[model samples]
Target: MRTYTFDQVEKAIEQLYPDFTINTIEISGEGNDCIAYEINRDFIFKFPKHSRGSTNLFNEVNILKRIHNKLPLPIPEVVFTGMPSETYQMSFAGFTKIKGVPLTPLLLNNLPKQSQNQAAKDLARFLSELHSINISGFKSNLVLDFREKINEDNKKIKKLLSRELKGPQMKKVDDFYRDILENEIYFKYYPCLIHNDFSSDHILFDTEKNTICGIIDFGDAAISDPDNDFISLMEDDEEYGMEFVSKILNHYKHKDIPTVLEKYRMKEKYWSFEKIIYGKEYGYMDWYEEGLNEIR
Candidate 1:
């Protein structure tokens, strides 16, 4: 990857920005490929370098184009797509950013009891619809490289663990992977499209309406075990979040509830750690330090 400096970014935005006067530029998140700038209209500029590449950029556009209206909540609009220039090596997409600040309080705490219940109810509906999305022709058109990607991620974890960890913790994670290979039970469940990182961050809340205004960042969107959506919350025992899982699975599951296994719990813990190491090795400090904090 080419190293891009702030001055280089500034010059590119000046040349390619839809509007000349940007209120200010602020980098949000630990994500490497994107930043948010508060312009006359709020917006995010996403640089495309993800494994999914530009195909994901355009696929996001198409997916938003198709479902913007049908969503159970509000969503941002991709107002502009910019081509690559000398300053920035990759393509970028600009969004008409959603209003209201991040709902950290409601998401992290401070939510009314009823609001939490309603959030589960609404998410169940949203997950049901998302779970049912017909993507038969999608795999042909999109990047759905699961095993390769998982192996790549596991490799990242190994590299990082080699550098920093050297004992039982590493062995625990390794054994977790072995269980996934030897035991094939979780694969038997029906698969569905998952946001994969369906945490509170990607979702926006308009508390006044008790509704989601929009969801952002579709990079990890793919077909997988619906349980993958639950991974983001697996930290901290995740019981509060599990209530939402109950609601979602209720919508998708009929007479049978998929059995949760002891080994699967270990696998979930391993993937969570892998995401942690993956972030650290790649210099995403937020997740890296968070990973350290998780182990501590």
Candidate 2:
């Protein structure tokens, strides 16, 4: 919420780190939830946009520490953290950067055919390992909550979608909710540690190495259906949409792969509605409009 320029950020870091040298403090990864600054081109400083983002940051950092060595790919390792001070109000985190270009549709396709296939195996393995971790000792928020989703609908989405969404597609989303409610499947099985925000933008790739180097932003990781991770992959830049999703699924190894794939298909059908709700909450009106157009 507090807007600070590069000079302000430099001053804060100078005061806080004391000995840490700063050459160029440029802003990068202007994510919806966090205003991120790249320090010395090797470290990342993330400050929250609001209290909601702060809570997510707080929760995920602890989760990160727990699963640090568990993940095969390199993830951001926290180096230093800053709490609220008179200069800055919200909590911030500094982590060493994972050097690579974050994946985009064009970037992904530009790589060699062998490289793309290798990437599929890499990412597939990442999700397979991620979902296998036991999250029983963690906090309750990680546990999937259907009622909470229903409550969110009651509050923000209260019969409002009918204006643009009332047809066979609308009924499809209803089925999704009922399916989750009746099965309570996330809890039924051992709750899988899911990257609730798994997408191209969050997945980092190494061009020279020709593979997925790392994953980023555990800001929304939680214990939920493995299907949730596959949702975003299904909607991509035409060629990489469901086609790429199938490639990853083909390489993925899990005990319940069939069930996860089945659920992924149905959930992907209503992905736009999910984005609409998220956009509304985060004040990303552009994303809100994109969702509206997709549904229409």
lDDT of 1 by residue, 1-296 (tens): 33445565566667776466666666543355444444455777665544334545666666666556655656668776666455433466677878655444346356776776666667667766776777664654444444544566667666766656758877766675666656555555466666666767677777676655666767657777666665454334533344555555565563444443342375565656765866754445667756654653
- Clashing pairs for predicted structure model 2, backbone only: none
lDDT per model vs. reference: 0.59, 0.74
Over the stretch 2-27, how does candidate 2's per-residue lDDT look in tens digits?
56688877776777788988898788
Instruction: Name the weakest run of 10 consecutive residues (lDDT summed) in model 1.
Output: 254-263
Assess every candidate by TM-score: 0.71, 0.80
Which regions of candidate 1 fall more than 4 Å away from where they truly are? 1-10, 17-32, 48-63, 85-89, 103-109, 139-175, 234-239, 251-264, 272-296
